Amino acid sequence: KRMDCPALPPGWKKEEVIRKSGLSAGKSDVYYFSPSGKKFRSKPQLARYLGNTVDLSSFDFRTGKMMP
DNA sequence: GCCACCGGTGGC
DNA sequence: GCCACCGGTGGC
Ligand SMILES: [Ca+2]
């Protein structure tokens, strides 16, 4: 389920998806959804989309929390 | 053509 | 040996 992510700017949501088949079955992937609905799979991709005005240095992609 | 899904690996 | 990061792609 897509859950609100207050660590991000307004509108952002986070989803954890459990892999269903293959040797990695049971592994989790984390996705973030922009307010406009675009999907992001890594902190570099996320940071490039948001740009310099948003400080993600303390941002922990896997947990979705600021981890300082 | 798109994209959800799993596999591969460079850097640590 | 692990995993952040992203490539390949089958099913639509
Ligand atoms: Ca916020």
Counting DSSP H or I runs of 4 or more residues, the number of helices is 1
Percent range of helical residues: 10-25%
CATH class: Alpha Beta
The assigned CATH architecture is 2-Layer Sandwich
Q: How many domains, in number, for the residues?
A: 1
Ligand types: calcium ion
Shape: globular
Q: What's the CATH topology name?
A: Methyl-cpg-binding Protein 2, Chain A
**N-to-C span:** 26 Å
- CATH superfamily placement: Methyl-cpg-binding Protein 2, Chain A
Enumerate the strands of the largest sheet in spatial order, edge to edge or round the barrel: 1-2-3-4
The tally of beta strands, per DSSP, is: 6
User: Which structural class matches the secondary elements?
Assistant: alpha+beta
Rounded Rg: 13 Å
For the biggest sheet, the summary is: 4 strands, antiparallel
Strand content bin: 25-35%
PDB class: transcription/dna
Keywords: Structural Genomics Consortium, SGC, TRANSCRIPTION-DNA complex
Assembly: trimeric
Entry title: Crystal structure of MBD2 complex with methylated CpG island
